[model samples]
Target chain A: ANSFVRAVERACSERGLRLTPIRANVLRLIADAGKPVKAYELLDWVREADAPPTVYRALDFLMANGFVHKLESVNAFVACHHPNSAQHSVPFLICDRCHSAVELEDRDVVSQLEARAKALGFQPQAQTLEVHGLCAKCAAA
Target chain B: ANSFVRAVERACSERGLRLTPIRANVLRLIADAGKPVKAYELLDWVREADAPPTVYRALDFLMANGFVHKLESVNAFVACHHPNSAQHSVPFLICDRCHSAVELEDRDVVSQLEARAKALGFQPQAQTLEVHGLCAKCAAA
Candidate 1:
């Protein structure tokens, strides 16, 4: 987790990105969650603020810098497992039954999606891939 | 556009999905656009009551039944290019410059993402894969 923070700081520096307290702290908290975390849960982490906009602002900053990700289908956010350090695409497997999310950094997945996109004349840049389903544990239960 | 409406109606018959006047009308507008249609763009076609919420509810219905897709990165909705077919995975590429979108059914993309999810004991149901960038024409420009 600490290494993640260090990498985020370094990521912001060379690109002239600002890792402000709000952004840094939120990123830290998200990393600590070890799972997809919602805005309310984040506020709970702070126990904490009249800061909805502030939270979102910081979230936006972190996301733009590639330090965090918003799981679109669920409207929650997750820390990018590897920040500027590992520039891989973001893919999610969200378990509806238990609300557990697993982030996958499968470069091959990106290559394949882009390959298909290419066939259609799309010059792909950023990709959002989240899968919704049941985790094996929940599936068995 | 009418071809799309007939197709949508027939698709919904045996199933429980509704292709009502507003839903059917709105969808026809999208198919006519020949591109990814945004919500406000849909309203431009409606120009009628409770426009905002009405478009949203209809979109929610369209998306839930796999007849429409919400490009999470763009916050815009596109009629599912596949519609009432292909139970395959969906991946999109949106042109940042032109507002154009393409949906691809890439089964390998699904298998690859699922492979890692499987390792984590997850069973995926739905996938959201939208890529943002300049399309071929836009990129050349």
Candidate 2:
């Protein structure tokens, strides 16, 4: 927990940003959850704020800064394990059986698929690659 | 057009898969459209059949066998440009400005991200890595 706090503090200082208590708390809650949490659910933790926009704005900032990732499939946010880097093209391997997510690096896979697309005269702009299957733990269990 | 017919015929012959006339027509219509086609939109093409189950069944067969890709985000299906291979991961780069999609290969990217996850004690099972941005065409236009 302390390490996360320090990381957030360092990130803010390095970026010439300020970490308000609210924002810091929000980040802390998301990081501690260790999994994706919906915006509405986060509201349950901090009831003092009542509007959806307020929470969304905070989330948007965190997302823009690479502090979190919004899982479009589930409409939730998870603390980005990797921060402030070009690793934004991270592939999420979500387990259908257990909902466990693993991020993988596969530029080669994307390139090979793109090459095929080019042959078809179709230029790909973005890719969403989600595979559904049982995770190792789930399979063992 | 003849090539498409032959391709479908070959697929059925090689796999013992039955491509009923209605199914073939639906697939042909989608393929000719050259873009993602919604199920209801396809309904218009197969109006004679006039049954949701009929169109759905054909789509199911094509999707199950990798002849098409279901865009979960939009509830649409795109004819798979490459269909001879077994199951593999497809990375899509989507253009937010024009809604154009680009498919690419990025196994190296996925693997590197996976290494980061292993270090964090998070077990990844499946991944959906979709990056949304402006494509070159959109940027130029």
Candidate 3:
């Protein structure tokens, strides 16, 4: 978590972006979570009565800058595994039983889908690929 | 559109499902759209003073029954092309500029992703795969 925060901090400095205290704190919370975190949970952890708008704004910045990813299916945010790299889409494997989420770490599925779309006369941009089911531990149990 | 409705109607009848008046109307509106339809637009087209809950309820039924799909990225509903089949996920090519959505009509991507997930000990159930960009016509223009 510390390394992830430091990495994003340096990236922000080099890119002329401002990682304000609130934004940094939000990032810290998400990274430390090591799991997908919901917005309301962030509110509870941040402990600020006036934090709704500020937290949402910080989220917008983080998402726009590619430091975090929102799992739309689950309505939660997860820190990007490759924060040091540019923003890109990766498939998420979410365990429904345990509510655990992990990056699929496969690029072929994304590229194949993009190619299929182009063949159908569609120019692809970003993709949201999420698979939901049971993770190994849950499946085992 | 008429055929799609009839197909769904028949499927519901055979499956012992109830396609209530509001639900049928919602399905009609979505099928007539031939494009993604937002909930607010459905409410507007529904023209019921107390239609919010009923419309949402209808949408939930349609989606659960595989008669329509909810585009998570766009928060819009599109009629499923294969209403006769069981509920399944398909990658959608959503034109960001034109606001058009089309099913990619490819099963390989879905199966491949499922295989990858299973390989990692993830028992995949459902998938949300949406690609956002320009359609061929919009890209040309």
User: In terms of DockQ, which candidate is strongest?
Assistant: 3
Worst 10 residues of 3 chain A by lDDT: A43-52
Q: Which regions of candidate 2 fall more than 4 Å away from where they truly are?
A: A2-6, A20-22, A43-48, A72-75, A104-132, B1-6, B39-49, B72-75, B102-136
Residue-wise C-alpha lDDT for candidate 3, range B17-97, written one tens digit per residue: 978878888899899997899889999999946548988988999988888999988888999988866789798899998
Alpha-carbon runs more than 4 Å astray in model 1: A2-22, A39-61, A84-86, B14-18, B40-44, B47-61, B86-88
Residue-level lDDT for B53 in candidate 1: 87
The native-contact fractions of the candidates, in order shown, are 0.88, 0.37, 0.89
- Tens digits of lDDT, candidate 3, A1-141: 887888898889888698898899899999888779999898888884555899889988999888999998888999887885567888999999888888756688889988898888898888999998899999999
Candidate 3 achieves a global lDDT of 0.87
Tell me the whole-model lDDT of each prediction, alpha carbons only.
0.78, 0.66, 0.87
Q: Model 3 off-target regions past 4 Å?
A: A13-18, A48-54, B18-20, B48-55
Between candidates 2 and 3, name the one with more favorable lDDT. Answer: 3
When sorted by DockQ, best at the front, the candidate numbers are: 3, 1, 2
Q: Candidate 3 has which clashing residue pairs, if any?
A: none
Model 2: fnat (fraction of native contacts): 0.37
lDDT of the structure predicted as candidate 1: 0.78
Give the alpha carbon lDDT tens digit for every residue of B29-55 in model 1.
777777777788788778846457887
